[model samples]
Target: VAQISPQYPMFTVPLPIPPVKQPRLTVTNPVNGQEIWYYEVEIKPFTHQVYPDLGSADLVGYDGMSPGPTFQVPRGVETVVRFINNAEAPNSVHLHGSFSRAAFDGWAEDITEPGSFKDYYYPNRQSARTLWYHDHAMHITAENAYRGQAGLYMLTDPAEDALNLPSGYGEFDIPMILTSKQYTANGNLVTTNGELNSFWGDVIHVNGQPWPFKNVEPRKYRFRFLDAAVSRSFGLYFADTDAIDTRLPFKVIASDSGLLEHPADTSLLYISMAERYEVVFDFSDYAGKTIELRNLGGSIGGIGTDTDYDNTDKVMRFVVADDTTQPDTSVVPANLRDVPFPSPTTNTPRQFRFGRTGPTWTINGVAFADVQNRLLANVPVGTVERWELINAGNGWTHPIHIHLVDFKVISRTSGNNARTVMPYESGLKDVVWLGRRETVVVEAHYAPFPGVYMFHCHNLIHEDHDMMAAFNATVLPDYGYNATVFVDPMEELWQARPYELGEFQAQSGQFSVQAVTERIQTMAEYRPYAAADE
Candidate 1:
C-alpha cells in the first residue's frame, strides 16, 4: 500500500461565485394562451483560471461561463430556451427536475448537432425546488459535462417567494456547486487509470474555483448545496477552530425534489453526486469568526472518498464579517408544502439490481441497448408503484437518478441493519445515492400524462457505460376527456413518430451511418479499470 499525495492549486484562490441573470421576456401572446420566456444560450470553448497562479486551461461552457448562468423563473411560467450548439460536438440540454414533454426532455439521442439550433420548452408546474440543467447527449454526457456544461435552475412560486427565507440570488441566498477535476502536466484534462471508473481530483472546488473562500455577513443565510462533482461523495460539516468539541449545526429546509414540512437541524450533512440540499447557517453569534466547511471521507478513498483530509477534505472557508446591524427577518416555517407522505403498497412493486460484468454495466442483469425496442417496463398511467433499487456490492457507489416524477424514499435496509428515512430525505426527491450492498425502497406515482422516462446512475461515467434503462407509461384511451379542445403539437409528434430513445439521431440525417457505428464500437471498448490515458 502507498500513501496518496496532494497536487497543486489546492487552496490558492478565491471562489468565483456565479451572478444571477433574469430570463428576458421575449414574447407575450394572450391569444395563444401561452407566456414565453426566452433565453439565448451559446455553447462554445472558453478559458478559465481555475487557480490564481496555476494559469488558465481550455474548457467548454455555456454563454462563456463555466457553470453557466442562473435562471430565475416564477412558477407556472412557460419558459423557452433557444440553444445554439456552437461547440464542435453534438450537444443537448436536460433540465434535471422539470416535468417536460418527451420531445424536450433531452433524451440522450435527441441531440442538437454542431452549428445547429434547438428550442426547449419547460412547463414549470412543479412546486418550488432547486433544479439543475446539464448535458445529456447520448454516450457523451461525461466528456461534455466534465468540460463544463451545467448550470442552476431555480423555480419560485408565490407561496415560496412569500416565505422570506434568506431571499436573494448570489447574495445571502447562495448556490454552492462542489466539483473536482484532474489535469496533466500540460494542463490538459487527465483521463488516466486513477479515474477509469470515477475521477477524483486532488483538489476540491466551490462554485468554479479551487478551495476558495467567501465573505459572509453576520446573519442567517441560506445556501443551496449541490454536489456537481463528477464522481466524489461528501459528508459536509462546519467546524469552529477555536472550539474543537462544540458543534455548529445548520438547518436543512429542502431536498432535491422540494421543500420539507419543516427545517431539520443537523451538524453533519451527507451528499452524493447530483444531490441537492437547501441549508440555512446562522452566523449572527459568530461575528468576526472564520469557519471551515469540511468533508468527511466515504467508502472508497480517493475515488468516492476524500482520502486526504488535511488537504482535499477542506472544502472552503467562510469568514463572517463584523456587521451586527443587518436587518434579518427570515423564517423557517413549521409547514413548507402540503404534499402528503406516499402510502405503502406492494401491488405495483418492482425490483432493480445494479451490477457490472466485463466492460459493461447492467440493470437487472441487462445492459442498456439502443432505444429502438428497449422498454424495461410498461407502467400503468396514474398508478403509484413501490420500487426497490438494490445495489450489487461490487465495491463501488452509484448515485441513482430517475427522471420526470418526484418520489418519496420509504426505507433503506442493508444486511441486518435497518433504518428509516432521515428528516432531510422526508421531502420529495429525484436522485438517491446507493452505497455498496444497499437496498432503497422508494414510491412514486405517474400522473398527468403518459410518456417514456429514464432511470440510471448519476455517476456520469457509469451512465455513459450502459448503466441506464427506459420505461414507457401507457396512456389509457379514456385518460383525457375534455382536457383540451386543441391537441398538443408535442403530443402529436410523439404519437406520429413514436417515442424511441435513439430515434432522434437515427432520423435526423446529421450523422453518417459510419459515425454512428464508430460511436457504438468505441463505447464497447470502454474499460473503466484500464490503466491508460486513452
Candidate 2:
C-alpha cells in the first residue's frame, strides 16, 4: 500500500501531555496468599500531551500516554486492583479480555467519583493471554478515552514462560497498539460527540507512529497488536505474497484476549476496537523480499477490508526483508491451552443491535438509562452458559463485552466466519466483534461473584450515544428454613448470612459487594474441591 499524493495538506499544532513522572500502578504479593498476585490500578482522567494519529493535535490520556502502561503479572495469581478515581469525573478500568471481579467491570454507575476508590478483586483463573485495559467512562467515555487513555494487561503463567518463547520484553517483543484517525487541517484530532462523525480515519498508524518502519534481523518475532481505535475496523495482511512463498505464513497463536486453542494458519486477520492478537512472523525465507503489512480497505489501501466499508475486499500491506538471519525459535505448540466447551444445551440465545438509532443507540431497542438495565438472567456462579448474539442493526461492528468475566468463542455465523476466525479468537474474551447482520455463539461462565454487572458494545462513540446497558446474573440462594426473626425472613437471613442473595439491583449506595464475597468464600470452603483438600 502506498500513500496518496500531497496527503490533503498537513495540520500545524503542538503535542500536549508532556512526559512527566506520575504515580505508577503497583502489583504486589498478598500476605499468606502468595498463590495470587494482587495489582491495584486507579482509574482517573488527566490531560497530557499526545501526538495524534495524522501528526496533528496533541490529545489527552488516562495516565500521561496515549497507550497506557502494559501490566505484566503472573498467572493463577489473584489480582486485586483498588481503582482510585482522581479525575473530576467518574472512571473505571475495563480489562478487555482478562477475567476480573464483577464489580471491576467498569460499568458506568459502578464508578469511583473524584477522590473515591473501589476495590476490584479477581483470581487470575486462566492461562497466559494478551489482554488490554481502557477507560469505560459512561456517556463521555469515547471522548475521554479516544483522547489517549488505553494500555495493555498481560498474563504470564509459568507453563508458557518455561517454554523457550521469545524473551527480551522491551527489546524483542513489541506491543503494537494499532490505531487510525482522521485529522483537521488545523492540527487537532477529530472527535465524534454524538453521531456527527463516525470517527472514520483516513490514515493508519503502528505504535503511535505513522508509516512505522522498524529494523530487525531475519528471525521469528512476536507481534502483539491491539486495534484500539474508536470506530475504525481493519483487515490486516502482508503485501507481495508469491504463491510459492512458504515463509509468508504467520502463525496466529492468540487473539483479543490471549493464546488460541490452536495455531491458526492465515496471513490475513481482522481486529476491531479493544481486540488483540499474538502472532509470530518468520521472515527467514523472505530475507531478500519486501512485504507490506497492509489494511484491506479498498479505497484507503487497507490491509483487511476492501469493500469501501462494504465488506468486498482486503487491505493492509507488509514488506518482507531481503536481508536474513536464523530464527532463535521456530515451533508451534499443538495444544496451547484447554478452554471450556459449553454444550449447545447451555446456549442462551441472545440478540443485540449496533449502529445508531434515533437520539440514542441501544441494545434490544432500549437505551441505557441510569437504572433501566435489560436483565439477562440469574445464573449460578461457575455455570458455563452459551450466548447467541444476533446483530440486527446497520452494518457497523460492535465489540460485545461482559462484565467481571471472560467468554470463549464457539461458533460465529456471518457470511464468511469460518474463514476469518484466526487462532486468537477461539479462547476467552470479554469483547467480541459483532459484524453487520452477523450472529456469534460464545461459551461463557458466570464468574464466582454474584451481583449486578453490565454487557454492552465497546465502541466509545456508540456507547456515549447510548449503545450500552447493564445486566445481572443472580446466583442461586442456599437452602434455609423460613423463620421470621424480625418479621422478614429474607431480610433476617440476609443480615445473618454474611452475604447477599436477593435479586440483583443497581442501586449504587444499597449494593454491597463485600457482603457477597464473604458468602462465596464460605461456599468455596464447603465445596468438594476445597473440602477434599481439607
Candidate 3:
C-alpha cells in the first residue's frame, strides 16, 4: 500500500509551520559598507515523519526540516546566506524568484560538495514577494529536492505596508508549501521518474505534513502558497468542486514575483513546480464549519476533467471559528501595489523552443550539456526584449523560470492556452507555465544585473535531464549583488571539507547571531564562506 494507499487518514495532523530563520551574525560589506544579515543554513540529513501514523522517511533537508526554515526578510535589508552542506552528497541552493547576480543565483555546476559551504548574497532591493530556496545541484535536482531541500523566503516591502493585507506570521500571515510525493509501504519517498522525465507522486504534502488541518479564527489570512514539487502541476480550488462558480470567498493578491495591482477573483489557481500565488482567504463567513482545500489531478501536463476525491483530493482542512481575544482588524484593500507592464522596446523575439533532441530535453535543439558553445542570449543590461517561450512537446508542460527578471505575459499566440493574458496571470511573474504546443510572449526589462544567468524548466525532472539554458546579460563593471567586486568565475571554489551537524550546532547555540563577528571568508573579498572566524 504505497502508491495508492488508503490506510492513512486525513486532517489528523496539525499543519506544520516552519520556523523563521534567525541570523547567525550581522556583518558590514567591506566594499560598500552596507550592513547585511548573515545566515548559516545547514543542508543535512533528516528523518521526515509527514503524518501522525506514517513511519519516518530518510531524507536530506535544510537545517533538519523538510520544508525548511522561512527567511522573513524585509525589503532593502540585504543579506548574505552561507549554506553549509552537511549532507554527503553535493547540492546548490537557488534563491528562486530573485534578481540576484549569476554567481549567487546558484549555477548548477558551482555546487557545494559534502563538507563545503557557499555564500549567496541578496540585495533585497526588489518589491515584496514570495521567494524560495531549493536545491539546484547539477543534474540531480529532482533527486535532491525530492529527498527534501526546499524552504520559503518571504520578501517584504514598505509599499505594501499601507495595504493592510494580513499581518503576523503564525497568526494571519501563513505560508503554505505544497509538494507531491510517493512513499514506500514503510513511508520512504520514492521517485519513479526514469524515462518520462517527470515525477508525479501519489500523495500531497502541505507544509511537510500529509493532508493536514489548520485552525483559523474568523479573520482574513494571507496564505502564500508555493508549489515546491518536483514535477506535479496542481489545479487548486476550495472545498469540493473545480467549478469556477464555487466561490471560495478569497482573492489572489499576488503571483510569483509580487503583489498585483488589484485582487484577482479566480476560482481555481493552477500552479506548477516553482510557481507561487498568495491569496487572502477571508474566512469570516464560515466561522463554525470546516473548509477543505482541494486539488484536482489529471495527466502529466495539466488537470483535465478528473478529480482525485479519495486520496490526493483533499490537501488540507481549514477549521475556522470565532476568537474573542484577537479580533480581526486586517482589511483586503481594493488597490494594491502599482506594477507597470513591462512593454518591450525591441522587436526581436528570443524564441526558447522547449522540445527534445534525441533522448535529451532541449531548448532550440541545444541541450544544456553542450550549452558552453551555444549561448542562449547575450543581451544588454538595459534593454527590454520579448521572449517567446514555445513548448514544442506534444503532451508535456513546462513551467519556465527566468533568472533575475520579472516579466509580463504579453500574449499566448498559439495552442490551447491562446489568449492576450489570463486575468489571474497578468501580474509581474518570473515563472510562466507553458502547456503542450503553447507559445507565450513575455516582455521583461533586463535591468541592473550583468552576468551569466540561467533560465530553466522548473519541473525538477525536466530541469535535470538537460532542459536548461544559461546566457549572459551584460553591464560593465558588475555593479549589483556583487557591487565593485570582480565577477566570479562561475565554477566551484570550495576547498574545505564537511562539518558534522553536532559541532556546527554547538558553535551557534547561545550566540544570539547579531553580535560583532568577522564575515565568513571562503573566497577573496566578498566570497565569505571560509568560516574564517574560527
Candidate 4:
C-alpha cells in the first residue's frame, strides 16, 4: 500500500476520464414491478485515451466499445428498449431470446438514420435463462458482430430467485462471454479483407480480457457461458482430477432457452456460434484452489481442441477462500421447471435452405433482391409450423434466426445427442446455430399478420454479403398465391453494385447495342464466385 496525505502525494493518480458524447441507451421495465435498466450502446469507431484497442475497428458500434452492454430484465414483464443510432452508418439492435413482434426484430432495412432513434418493445416471457443481443444488419451482419457489437441478455423470473440460486451481481454470479480470434502482432485484429479469408484466431478472451482471473469463496458458483465467436467453435471442460472434483464438477443447469429438463452431469460441454450454457460447480472440496475453466477448441483450426483447450481455454482465476461463517443457504435442485411443449395442433411447418450450390450463401438457392422473383415460404396466420432448416453449405457454421417467433430444438442429428436431450434441448430459444451438414428442426407459431419477414444468419457479415432472404408470412388467398406474378422460387440475389450509389446518365443511347453485349459478359465474370445458374 502507498502512503497518502493532504499535502504533496507520493504520486498523482490519474483522474476519472470523462464520458464521451454517446447515445444514452436504456431498456426499461414496462411493468409495475422492479425497474430493469440496461446500458444500450450504439457501438461505433472512436479514439480513446485509455481503451485504445476499441478504436479503429472496421465495424464500429453504438457503445464506442465492443460487445455493446449488458442487459438486465425481469421475467413476466414487458421489455422496452430505446435505441439511438448515432454512428456514421445505419444500424439495428436485436435481442436474442424468446421474443415476438417483427417490428422490433431490428430489420436491417428498418435501421434508423444517423441522429435518429427508435424504441422496440417485447415481452420478457417466463424464461429464467441466458440470452444474447447483437447486430442483424442485412448482409454485413458477420462483419458488424465480428467487430464486438455483442453482449449477454438475462431473463429472470421470481420463481428462479426463490430457488436460492447464486446471488450477488458481481461476486457469486458473473456473465462470461468467450470468444477467440487471430490478431496481428501489432495488436490489430485480422480480418479476411482479401487474402486472409480462412484464418483462425491465435488468442482467446473471456469478458474481453486476454486471461482474466476472478476471486471466489470455496462454495458454489454459477457461470453463464456464451460462445459469440464469429467463425470459431468451442468445447468447454472443467478439471476432472478426482471424483470430488467431479461431484458438482460442471453441471449445465440451463441452456439457451432456460433450465434444462434436468442438469446434465458431464465432463465436456460443446458449444458453437450463438450458443449459451449455465453451469454450476461446487468448490467446497478445494477451498484454496485456483482453477482455469478451459475450452478445448474443436478439431477446426484455432477454435477447439479435442483433449485440452489449446486455443479456447480462457483462464478464469478463481481462488476458493474460507467457507461460509453462517449456514449454507443455497442448493442446486435436481429438477427445474419444464416449459410447456408446443401444441401440435398449432403446427405449420416451413422449409428453408442454406448456401448456394457452387459457392456463396443463399436461402432457397437464390440471392436477395434478385431481379428474378425468389420463392419465399408461404403460410397462413395462426399456423404452427415446424421449420426444417437444412444446411447444405460447404463449410462454416450458420446461426439461423427467425423473426417474430421463438422456437424449440425438436431434434438434431449430430454428436452428443444425449447431451442435447432432457436438459439442454428442452429450453426456449430464438436463435439456433447449425454447422455444416447439420439440420435443425423446430416448431413455432406466427403472429396474425400478412407481411414480408426477414431470416438470415446472426453473423452480420454473411448477411450483408447477400447471405440473406425475405419471406412473406402471408395469409394468401384461396388461389394460393398466383404462381406467375408472385416472387418465384428462383429469384436472383439483390446487389447495389450494378446500380452504384447514384443514378446513371445515358446520352441518347450511346453505343446501346455494344454496351448491352459487354454488360452481360462482365456480369457473368464479376460474380462468378456466386452460384450463377442456381
Summarize candidate 4's per-residue lDDT along 387-447 as a digit string, tens digits.
8887754355566877655567786654323222234556666667665556788887654
Model 3's TM-score against the true structure: 0.89
The residue ranges of model 3 lying beyond 4 angstroms of the native Cα positions read: 1-6, 30-34, 51-54, 192-196, 240-247, 299-310, 322-324, 417-420, 476-516, 520-534
Ranked candidates (TM-score, high to low): 3, 1, 2, 4
lDDT of 4 at 443: 83
* Candidate 1 residue-wise lDDT, 343-448, digit = tens: 5567856898877867776787666665554467877767788888887574667778887778898887654243336678887888887765668888887644
What is the C-alpha local distance difference test score of candidate 4? 0.55
Question: How well is each residue in 417-441 modelled by candidate 3, as lDDT tens digits?
Answer: 5334667687899998887667788
Candidate closer to the true structure by TM-score (higher is better), 3 or 4:
3
Candidate topping lDDT: 3
For each candidate, what is the lDDT?
Answer: 0.70, 0.56, 0.75, 0.55
| Candidate 1 local distance difference test against the native | 0.70
Q: Evaluate residue 488 in candidate 3 and report its C-alpha lDDT on the 0 to 100 scale.
A: 47
**Please, what is the TM-score per model?**
0.85, 0.75, 0.89, 0.72
Residue 313, model 4, lDDT: 47
